[PDB]
Design an enzyme around this catalytic site. Structure first.
Site, PDB file in Angstrom:
ATOM      1  N   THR A 188       1.313 -44.943  -8.576  1.00  0.00           N
ATOM      2  CA  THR A 188       1.228 -43.554  -9.014  1.00  0.00           C
ATOM      3  C   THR A 188       0.262 -42.758  -8.145  1.00  0.00           C
ATOM      4  O   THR A 188       0.587 -41.660  -7.676  1.00  0.00           O
ATOM      5  CB  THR A 188       0.795 -43.489 -10.474  1.00  0.00           C
ATOM      6  OG1 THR A 188       1.729 -44.213 -11.282  1.00  0.00           O
ATOM      7  CG2 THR A 188       0.741 -42.051 -10.930  1.00  0.00           C
ATOM      8  N   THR A 189      -0.932 -43.305  -7.910  1.00  0.00           N
ATOM      9  CA  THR A 189      -1.905 -42.640  -7.053  1.00  0.00           C
ATOM     10  C   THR A 189      -1.396 -42.490  -5.624  1.00  0.00           C
ATOM     11  O   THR A 189      -1.845 -41.591  -4.904  1.00  0.00           O
ATOM     12  CB  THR A 189      -3.225 -43.413  -7.099  1.00  0.00           C
ATOM     13  OG1 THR A 189      -3.569 -43.653  -8.471  1.00  0.00           O
ATOM     14  CG2 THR A 189      -4.353 -42.627  -6.432  1.00  0.00           C
ATOM     15  N   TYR A 208      10.774 -41.882 -18.436  1.00  0.00           N
ATOM     16  CA  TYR A 208      11.760 -40.836 -18.697  1.00  0.00           C
ATOM     17  C   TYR A 208      12.940 -41.307 -19.546  1.00  0.00           C
ATOM     18  O   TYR A 208      13.338 -40.604 -20.479  1.00  0.00           O
ATOM     19  CB  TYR A 208      12.262 -40.222 -17.384  1.00  0.00           C
ATOM     20  CG  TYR A 208      13.244 -39.091 -17.579  1.00  0.00           C
ATOM     21  CD1 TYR A 208      12.842 -37.892 -18.152  1.00  0.00           C
ATOM     22  CD2 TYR A 208      14.570 -39.221 -17.193  1.00  0.00           C
ATOM     23  CE1 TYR A 208      13.733 -36.854 -18.336  1.00  0.00           C
ATOM     24  CE2 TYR A 208      15.469 -38.186 -17.369  1.00  0.00           C
ATOM     25  CZ  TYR A 208      15.044 -37.006 -17.943  1.00  0.00           C
ATOM     26  OH  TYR A 208      15.935 -35.969 -18.125  1.00  0.00           O
ATOM     27  N   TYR A 258       2.779 -52.757 -16.105  1.00  0.00           N
ATOM     28  CA  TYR A 258       1.970 -51.543 -16.064  1.00  0.00           C
ATOM     29  C   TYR A 258       2.389 -50.645 -17.215  1.00  0.00           C
ATOM     30  O   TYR A 258       3.519 -50.145 -17.242  1.00  0.00           O
ATOM     31  CB  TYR A 258       2.110 -50.832 -14.713  1.00  0.00           C
ATOM     32  CG  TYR A 258       1.308 -49.551 -14.558  1.00  0.00           C
ATOM     33  CD1 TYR A 258       0.294 -49.217 -15.447  1.00  0.00           C
ATOM     34  CD2 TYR A 258       1.564 -48.678 -13.506  1.00  0.00           C
ATOM     35  CE1 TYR A 258      -0.432 -48.048 -15.299  1.00  0.00           C
ATOM     36  CE2 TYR A 258       0.842 -47.508 -13.351  1.00  0.00           C
ATOM     37  CZ  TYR A 258      -0.151 -47.198 -14.250  1.00  0.00           C
ATOM     38  OH  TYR A 258      -0.872 -46.035 -14.096  1.00  0.00           O
ATOM     39  N   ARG A 317       2.520 -41.027 -19.102  1.00  0.00           N
ATOM     40  CA  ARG A 317       3.376 -40.677 -17.977  1.00  0.00           C
ATOM     41  C   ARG A 317       4.828 -41.089 -18.176  1.00  0.00           C
ATOM     42  O   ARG A 317       5.735 -40.352 -17.781  1.00  0.00           O
ATOM     43  CB  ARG A 317       2.845 -41.322 -16.698  1.00  0.00           C
ATOM     44  CG  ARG A 317       1.536 -40.731 -16.208  1.00  0.00           C
ATOM     45  CD  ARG A 317       1.067 -41.439 -14.947  1.00  0.00           C
ATOM     46  NE  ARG A 317      -0.054 -40.744 -14.322  1.00  0.00           N
ATOM     47  CZ  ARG A 317       0.073 -39.789 -13.404  1.00  0.00           C
ATOM     48  NH1 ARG A 317       1.278 -39.407 -12.999  1.00  0.00           N
ATOM     49  NH2 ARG A 317      -1.010 -39.217 -12.888  1.00  0.00           N
ATOM     50  N   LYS A 345      -1.488 -54.009 -16.679  1.00  0.00           N
ATOM     51  CA  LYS A 345      -2.411 -52.943 -16.370  1.00  0.00           C
ATOM     52  C   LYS A 345      -2.226 -51.905 -17.464  1.00  0.00           C
ATOM     53  O   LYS A 345      -1.161 -51.317 -17.679  1.00  0.00           O
ATOM     54  CB  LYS A 345      -2.212 -52.289 -14.985  1.00  0.00           C
ATOM     55  CG  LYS A 345      -2.962 -50.990 -14.755  1.00  0.00           C
ATOM     56  CD  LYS A 345      -2.365 -50.271 -13.554  1.00  0.00           C
ATOM     57  CE  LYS A 345      -3.097 -48.985 -13.140  1.00  0.00           C
ATOM     58  NZ  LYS A 345      -2.304 -48.114 -12.297  1.00  0.00           N
ATOM     59  N   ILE A 365      -7.505 -51.751 -11.653  1.00  0.00           N
ATOM     60  CA  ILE A 365      -6.681 -51.094 -10.644  1.00  0.00           C
ATOM     61  C   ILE A 365      -7.139 -49.644 -10.653  1.00  0.00           C
ATOM     62  O   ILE A 365      -6.749 -48.852 -11.519  1.00  0.00           O
ATOM     63  CB  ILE A 365      -5.179 -51.238 -10.920  1.00  0.00           C
ATOM     64  CG1 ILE A 365      -4.739 -52.676 -10.639  1.00  0.00           C
ATOM     65  CG2 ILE A 365      -4.372 -50.296 -10.052  1.00  0.00           C
ATOM     66  CD1 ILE A 365      -3.297 -52.971 -10.990  1.00  0.00           C
TER      67      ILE A 365
END
Ligand SMILES: NCCCC[C@@](N)(CC[C@](N)(CCCCN)C(=O)O)C(=O)O
Ligand SMILES: NCCCC[C@@](N)(CC[C@](N)(CCCCN)C(=O)O)C(=O)O
Lengths: 296, 306, 296, 296
Positions: B55-56, B119, B145, B150, B174, B215
């Site tokens: 994501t980052t 989504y 994760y 999100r 995570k 993370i």
């Protein structure tokens, strides 16, 4: 502003041995057309856009376009993405392959800012010359396109003519139409189709219409004709099926219902989507018995 | 055949201090030379693993080929070091997630991070089948994760534990959910799994409850401090780890005044670690005010150079 | 700062024929004292403060004060209210009748602003000369005392010495102790007792300790000595009961458990509180069978 | 079923030197009557019920009853509590002192179960022979009266005739009236007054009507007469003030607005409620200038 309004159906995408059943797809669209629907939305959320390939996404838009030829029914192509470059490319394909407009969901997962959302949609709107409907569904995307941002896009971009709202927020629906009454507010939540229409909303993008197209289309046209009493009557009758179609995440229930009604040959999804629990399967089957489901 | 008793059968793991790598852009392309340079900076400041194209790293707006290129750079840059590569390999389409896992496996990654489908909101059963398919596709460690804010979905504790017990390669999760109750739930009922902090501000509470790594977004800017925090905690020096966590709170919070990775890239630019403050739409520069707020919090920390 | 910290119990209030069972009340308190508890919280949320009369509220504080005389156990009297004039009168009673300190929940229902919360709590703190522990539980009150407000109150009012947090927000607990490390952070959520203490929290105000006071006592004291391995082991062991004790709204499960253990003679609440479902009644009993319950 | 419907006002309670300004109270009610209001709700949330004494609570109901005597305007007295013994006593007083019915908010803070809510409201309804309107506001109480419970109470208790909903959940309002169309759904959120009425809601309990009783009255009566276009027109026009009246927690803005309009002598609250921020004070003033405020 060119607009696409009225009763619209978020088309399911039937699969057959892991492939798009293109023949059933066209048949399902003809069933929508023959039951009063004003436009069809290929490869939206209900169409499992996420798990279709780029080519399959494009194929289904073409099938929708071909099938609505010779009718008044428009094709509002699903063309959103959480990457602006991708959403721009999808808009351009839809325009160049006969779509009447595009539906563009707010970017999911990467959580853009209101400024980013503005630039995202400005780029999409500038790429094509067909109507663009925003799609707000924060429960799925993790973000929200504010009323101010929606209104700015509507006023600043020629092509952007309204928003499909799936946010359970009738306050926002008052806010939107009170401050920009020229926009086309589209219900994205079947259970509250009538309240959104009764506040000046001009259409629906329906999951339920997949199964009961005649009833959703009748509801919408009654409201658009300001027969709010007849529109509300259908909304109330449809609440039980409108609710059960979300007992699991859409489109798991609606595809189950389409299978139970004999409208698709297999209850096939692409992972991570899957058949519902046996309990929810049974609950869907039982709710369906109260409604008259049109065949082909 | 398949069985439900993988919990105590040797699991390859990737733990410790890990960095969710930013992806620098230069004239609308991946700055591959800056990418490798940033990874070497992480290696030289005590980091134990790097997470390319998460994501980052703006995974969403990278092309499939760019995604693959950054994994390869991460793999190449970490060769000859102790640092492992936990490649970002998630997708909301299982087919796609499987192919991404396979690429990471076939191109030298030590493991994969696989975010919950976003989504399309799969069910717990769907999430189970999604991760079962991924884990059965490769033979390298798989870290789940969970970040519901999100994705729109959550992997329940029961589902996570089932995946750990049913699939050989799934070794932990995570968590980015602001839910320390769930972190107790996970490790109280399945203490063999590796719980990884995905929220910098609560690195120490997650580590102090038996979490085995982080993370980190903050580690992009302050790799030495995040790695010191983690190693102190893993050594049960909870005084020193908590002291760093408290000191890092101000930067940990400001790095999310706008959606990550907008602030961290802003901070990397202000510190001179990337040459341009470039995103791919729909991500963009922060507001003036937040730009100023980030610059101003940074003044409290010693930012390592190259 | 005068403080009240360590292992603390939010005491249930047993009823007998619609009246406070004052003898059972004292007996339950003695049980807490004899099992390592450092302080008791009479007539808090777990004590059904909402349905007690002013006289019963005051009677129960007096029983607690009388019972802990001659022991090391303090009385942190429940004295909050959503009317500041009432909270001031309640604080004054607790001070004038021997309480060692007061717990004051944030005003519920009427949703004061952060400024209002500050003036509300300043009035209470200036009314008494005994410690005041704030209580934040937004799920019940509808408001939150922000970190800024808590810290300002801690710094501006001598007697306000910390906050009991029941907000499932470990980020906030880092925030509080990173920016004002002198305050006493008190866990108000049993399941995360160890995570809050391991970050520098100095006590718990426990529901579970009603049933398992020795276990919550050992957990707290292990943690305060930084024996985090032993403290975490008890927290992990306690998760199942800590969770089931909220399968319905507290204190419905804890009173049910106390009845199931034979520690109170009646499973009596005051409306709107009620017996749990028969299903949950059975679920609580089954979880309890895994734990070592002390008698009198 | 005896009902109380139409345009209703949640009356603010003006204070004067720390006391109820009883003369201003009656004058404000007289202003409501003269602008088409159907009923008044004394000592509700907007009336600062939480910080009035039992005797002030009782005094204002008497003032409301006396002032509406000889007019057709009814008094729907605020009589809820989170202690059933209290809620029954308040219901009994309201009947016994001339109120036409009672509003009874769901118990706040102690989070009763649905079974507890049913028994709580059953006890209230059985204590009196006047209409009982439920009040659901989960943002303030921390609990929700489920649709099933509301319908069950409506069907099982003679006096329970509907619910005032303040939950921003138009889906729930469709749910309620689709499954029990005989109940009286009352809008408790001014901004979405028209959507609730257009779906068959039969009235409002308004904060805004304190300042603009003529406009809220017209809105309700337009809708009840099925002139949905005119009702929507005022709802859209009223959105700005409807929204700004909650920029801080109600009744902080409305009392500020009433003071700014010169309709009350002082901007006095009871702690923990307080004056708004200078910024919001300015924002309320600004929004007010766009509306035509009736005098005395
Ligand atoms: N609807 C047809 C294409 C589906 C693509 C995707 N599944 C994911 C889109 C993507 N931007 C692909 C990035 C590839 C590198 N991970 C995403 O995963 O966010 C989506 O749009 O939901
Ligand atoms: N805590 C011991 C006495 C209980 C009092 C009360 N039941 C009601 C508190 C009150 N301020 C009383 C107002 C009386 C007029 N309704 C409230 O209900 O808000 C509560 O605080 O929960």
């Amino acid at each position: 502003k060119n607009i696409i309004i009225g009763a619209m159906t978020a088309l399911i995408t039937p699969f057959k041995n892991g492939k798009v059943d293109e023949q059933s797809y066209a048949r399902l669209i003809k069933r929508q057309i023959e039951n009063g629907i004003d436009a069809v939305v290929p490869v939206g959320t209900t169409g499992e856009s996420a798990t279709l390939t780029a080519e399959e996404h494009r194929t289904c838009i073409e099938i929708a376009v071909e099938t609505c030829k010779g009718t008044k029914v428009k094709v509002l192509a699903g063309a959103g993405s959480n990457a602006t470059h991708e959403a721009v490319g999808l808009a351009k394909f839809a325009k160049e392959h006969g779509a009447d407009g595009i539906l563009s969901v707010a970017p999911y997962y990467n959580k853009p800012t209101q400024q980013g959302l503005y630039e995202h949609y400005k780029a999409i709107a500038q790429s094509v010359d067909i109507p663009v409907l925003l799609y707000n569904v924060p429960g799925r995307t993790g973000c929200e396109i504010s009323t101010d941002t929606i209104i700015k896009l509507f006023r600043d971009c020629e092509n952007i003519y309204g928003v499909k709202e799936a946010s359970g927020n009738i306050d926002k629906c008052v806010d939107l139409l009170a401050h920009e009454p020229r926009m086309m507010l589209i219900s994205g939540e079947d259970a509250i189709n009538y309240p959104i229409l009764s506040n000046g909303g001009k259409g629906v993008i329906s999951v339920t219409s997949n199964l009961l197209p005649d009833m959703i289309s009748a509801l919408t046209h009654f409201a658009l004709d300001e027969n709010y009493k007849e529109a509300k009557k259908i909304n109330d009758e449809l609440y039980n099926i409108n609710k059960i179609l979300f007992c699991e995440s859409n489109p798991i229930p609606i595809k189950t219902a389409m299978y139970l009604a004999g409208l698709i040959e297999s209850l096939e999804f692409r992972l991570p989507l899957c058949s519902p629990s046996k309990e929810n399967f049974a609950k869907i089957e039982e709710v369906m018995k109260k409604y008259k489901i049109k065949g082909f």
